[PDB]
């Protein structure tokens, strides 16, 4: 019932998915060996959403790991959860894409797409009633940004009606860690706009800012950032696994978010993020959670939400709380930030309350915000691409794998349209 297939592409997406499976297993009480060690019946009633029963109390996650470089699969196998996944679910190539979208999307990952689709189909037909696909990747890389887009296109061709969720890490100028990341970012966002139905835009710069300021972490490792993204992912699909006062699954979220087909990019966040010192001296309540969800600093995208009006928003609360408090908080936020919300939609913010909080957490609230502020990020990427394409900075490395020069112009053509569409409704 409403099973979800999870696909991890690229190094960033693979690490994020590994941390996500750690978090999910902790929430559902699944031992790293795959056994069940939980103590609550609700941890097992909807275990079928993310896992497959192996009979002898073992629950194998429904995850497909893909990466052209076998190092990531080797690290995952040697990691704490090497035996958790199905050993034949690691579909890896021989050599990495070399940060080249052309390679992974046209030849090197093109050989692997057949096997990846075969394993995805094998996982899908085993489900009672598939709900959607979760695909984690990075826009800046080569193998992630190429294989993810190709696989998304193939899946959408094969499965036209099933929802598609992608948790894509977007490059930022302040964390510019690749010379040719704008090319891959544009070439991937084209396919994302074309095919997928819901993309969560994660940004490394915003995650570093959150870890440095809110949590006050001196040395934010990638484990912390992946844990933040994993908590967001778990919060998004908490209504599919735990009963609550007001349930909101993936399709309901998608319906409430998008007013138009191509405006399906979101900026997520987490409410109870508190420092080590202030953890004991802060009273966690529905207000504090709401004003932290809607706080500009808590957003996981480099673009400031205060620069553009919100289209739609939704906080998926977890834990026991009074729906009167939640409704009052939403009304108060709508009234205070009237300039930050669109006029043509009367009630913007959606709500959802889940009974079961995160393990070791009294209550939490996962925020999802569809705002026009993402136009700033898209403009930044478009400007970088234009700067690198006037003089054809690295175009030959991509034309050597079978592309034409016209494709890059077409890829940037939709960015101008995508920015315009978001800017169209901004006032």
């Amino acid at each position: 019932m409403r099973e979800i297939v999870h696909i991890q592409a690229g190094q960033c997406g693979n690490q994020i998915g590994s941390k996500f499976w750690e978090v999910i297993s902790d929430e559902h009480g699944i031992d790293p060996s795959g056994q069940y060690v939980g103590d609550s019946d609700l941890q097992l009633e909807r275990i079928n959403v993310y896992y497959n029963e192996a009979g002898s109390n073992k629950y194998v996650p429904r995850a497909v790991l893909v990466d052209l470089e076998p190092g990531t699969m080797d690290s995952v196998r040697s990691g704490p959860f090497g035996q958790l996944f199905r050993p034949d679910n690691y579909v890896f190539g021989q050599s990495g894409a070399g940060n080249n979208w052309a390679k992974g999307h046209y030849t090197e990952g093109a050989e692997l797409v057949d096997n990846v689709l075969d394993v995805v189909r094998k996982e899908a037909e085993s489900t009672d009633c598939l709900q959607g696909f979760q695909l984690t990747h990075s826009l800046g890389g080569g193998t992630g940004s190429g294989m993810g887009t190709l696989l998304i296109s193939k899946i959408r061709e094969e499965y036209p009606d099933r929802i598609m969720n992608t948790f894509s890490v977007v490059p930022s100028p302040k964390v510019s860690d690749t010379v040719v990341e704008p090319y891959n970012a544009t070439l991937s966002v084209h396919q994302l706009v074309e095919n997928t139905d819901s993309t969560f835009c994660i940004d490394n710069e915003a995650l570093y800012d959150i870890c440095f300021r809110t949590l006050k972490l001196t040395t934010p490792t990638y484990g912390d950032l992946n844990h933040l993204v994993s908590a967001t992912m778990s919060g998004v699909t908490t209504c599919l696994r735990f009963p609550g006062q007001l349930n909101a699954d993936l399709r309901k979220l998608a319906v409430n978010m998008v007013p138009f087909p191509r405006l399906h990019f979101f900026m997520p966040g987490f409410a109870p993020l508190t420092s080590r010192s202030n953890q004991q001296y802060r009273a966690i309540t529905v207000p504090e959670l709401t004003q932290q969800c809607f706080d500009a600093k808590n957003m996981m995208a480099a673009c400031d939400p205060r620069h553009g009006r919100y289209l739609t928003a939704a906080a998926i609360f977890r834990g026991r709380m009074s729906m009167k408090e939640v409704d009052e908080q939403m009304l108060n936020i709508q009234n205070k930030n009237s300039s930050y919300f669109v006029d043509w939609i009367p009630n913007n913010v959606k709500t959802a309350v889940c009974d079961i909080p995160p393990r070791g957490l009294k209550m939490s609230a996962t925020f999802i915000g569809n705002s026009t502020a993402i136009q700033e990020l898209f403009k930044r990427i478009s400007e970088q691409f234009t700067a690198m394409f006037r003089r054809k900075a690295f175009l030959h490395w991509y034309t050597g794998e079978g592309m034409d020069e016209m494709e890059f112009t077409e890829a940037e053509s939709n960015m101008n349209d995508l920015v315009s569409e978001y800017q169209q409704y901004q006032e």
Partner: protein, 432 residues
């Protein structure tokens, strides 16, 4: 599954390979006899004999047999496969034609056969490592011929060359401008990334840093081995944001002919001063960009950077690297081209450098090897061009090449090719 073939040509290349393989054996714990007491990182550089002995995947070729026989009588005589140490009878006498048309062809067949034998045994070939010297005769001509044939046979594989560029004023040969000019033409067609270094620059490094005023060719080499090990470490050691050779080429090479990066190793300080100095990530990143820290005798300040790769090692946090790069980009002295807004590529590895016993370098927790594709090397090629013009105005020593079976017009062809390359840098360095 990720292994690289290394080839050493000429006395300079072979002597560099000595230090390179000493460093690799130290890093992987392989005893110089080839036996490792006591876990799969050695697959990149070494092959398994099935009896616990590990043999390097290297082909060593030199027309003169003196240096190879010296190795075969040396301590490391037990590492390399005994019959892949290919030697000739007489050297090329600092003559390109001697090492290309007359003497080199007699041994090129055996050299290519051994390279093919290594490649067939290979399963995850990533690229080729070639060590040679531009000034020398064999290290220029035979390297040209060998890498030409290698490009013909394995055009789908990366070719990385670590050449010894002649210094601006420090020289040991009278005809080295001719050989370097002749090699410049052939490095453009086949070599994918040429990390040339200057003897004078490493001499200045060993003088200012390390407080050593009599550096030999045994100290310069150790540094080149550290550089190449830092480049390759992303293939055999786990870390965050590892950089493969293909990733390296994609991020560093903007145009098919603009593929001549520099090389630098920043944490090079004396042992007595290493302890009392705080070697933070910001400090090493800042001192990478010093003009006197580059291993090529050129001023990077005059040129404009186009692509920079920072291969950090040891105790490194990505937030620190990002902060250091932001600090570097905020500095106007380090100028980048306007058409490359994100000219930084980072590789962070968890394996700290291994210090050679009795070496000049101290133990440090973190290290970074910065490879920058800048236009500063156009000055070095211009001075070499001027030297060639001065020698070729009177046709000083071309009669040896003519008598060895080489047309005189080939010198003019190579000269015009180097002039075209310098014009290419002058064109590209102009902002959009």
């Amino acid at each position: 599954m990720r292994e690289v073939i290394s080839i050493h040509i000429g006395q300079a290349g072979v002597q560099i390979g000595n230090a390179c393989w000493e460093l690799y054996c130290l890093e992987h714990g392989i005893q110089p006899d080839g036996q490792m007491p006591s876990d799969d990182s050695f697959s990149t550089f070494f092959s398994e004999t099935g009896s616990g002995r590990h043999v390097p995947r290297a082909v060593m070729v030199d027309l003169e047999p003196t240096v190879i026989d010296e190795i075969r009588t040396g301590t490391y005589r037990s590492l390399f496969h005994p019959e892949q140490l290919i030697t000739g009878k007489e050297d090329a006498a600092n003559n390109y034609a001697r090492g290309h048309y007359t003497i080199g062809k007699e041994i090129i067949d055996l050299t290519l056969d051994r390279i093919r034998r290594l490649a067939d045994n290979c399963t995850g070939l990533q690229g080729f490592l070639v060590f040679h010297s531009f000034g020398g005769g064999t290290g220029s001509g035979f390297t040209s011929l060998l890498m030409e044939r290698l490009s013909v046979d394995y055009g789908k594989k990366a070719k990385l060359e670590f050449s010894i560029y002649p210094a601006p004023q420090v020289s040991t040969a009278v005809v080295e401008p001719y050989n370097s000019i002749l090699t410049t033409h052939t490095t453009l067609e086949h070599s994918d990334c040429s990390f040339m270094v200057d003897n004078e620059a490493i001499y200045d490094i060993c003088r200012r840093n390390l407080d050593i005023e009599r550096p030999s060719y045994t100290n310069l080499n150790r540094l080149i081995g550290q550089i190449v090990s830092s480049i390759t470490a992303s293939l055999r050691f786990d870390g965050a944001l590892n950089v493969d050779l293909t990733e390296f080429q994609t991020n560093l090479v903007p145009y098919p002919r603009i593929h001549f990066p520099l090389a630098t190793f920043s944490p090079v300080i004396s042992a007595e001063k290493a302890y009392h100095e705080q070697l933070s990530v910001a400090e090493i990143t800042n001192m990478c960009f010093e003009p006197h820290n580059q291993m090529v005798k050129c001023d990077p300040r005059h040129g404009k950077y186009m692509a920079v790769c920072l291969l950090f090692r040891g105790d490194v946090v990505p937030k620190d690297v990002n902060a250091a790069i932001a600090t570097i980009k905020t500095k106007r002295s380090i100028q980048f081209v306007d058409w490359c807004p994100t000219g930084f590529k980072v590789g962070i590895n968890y394996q700290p450098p291994t210090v050679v016993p009795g070496g000049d370098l101290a133990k440090v927790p973190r290290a970074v090897c910065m490879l920058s594709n800048t236009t500063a090397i156009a000055e070095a090629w211009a001075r070499l061009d001027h030297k060639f013009d001065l020698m070729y105005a009177k046709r000083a020593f071309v009669h040896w090449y003519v008598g060895e079976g080489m047309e005189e017009g080939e010198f003019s062809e190579a000269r015009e090719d180097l002039a075209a390359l310098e014009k290419d840098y002058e064109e590209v360095g102009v902002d959009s």
